[PDB]
Homo-oligomer: A and B are copies of this chain.
């Protein structure tokens, strides 16, 4: 399951990065720390406004990488911390996963990441 310090990061402001595999190289997009909705112990849901290239990539290769952190959360060896998340992604336009982020009226979909690993990298 996702660790306690990860939830501490989610209580603080920051830029989340999401990497996917494209045809000619990686792609990299963003969301905000506060926009992530955790379901169960292994699902993270992100509201999707754009992410057209990201969605195309996920459709061909479900594997994604996600990073996030905060200067304001104590890490393993000093001030500040962050995480590398590895997981499989899918997009949903309806159902409970979309409803989890439906408060964002600009959302055309939900990006659902099923987390396989969470590594505290700082």
A interface residue numbers (CB < 8 A to B): 13-15, 17, 19-21, 25-30, 32, 61, 63, 65-71, 80, 82, 84, 121-122
The complex is assembled from copies of this chain, and their number is: 2
Q: Is the interface of A mostly helix, strand, loop or mixed?
A: strand
The listed residue (B17, B26, B67, B70) touching A20 by CB distance below 8 A is B26
Name 8 interchain pairs, CB-CB below 8 A, sorted by A.
A13-B71, A14-B14, A14-B15, A19-B27, A21-B26, A28-B28, A29-B67, A30-B121
Q: Assess A28 versus B71: contact at CB under 8 Å? Given A14-B14, A15-B15.
A: no
Q: How far is the CA of A68 from the CA of B16 in the complex (A)?
A: 9
On whether the beta carbons of B30 and A61 are closer than 8 Å, the reply is no
Q: How far is the CA of A19 from the CA of B25 in the complex (A)?
A: 10
On whether the beta carbons of B19 and A28 are closer than 8 Å, the reply is yes
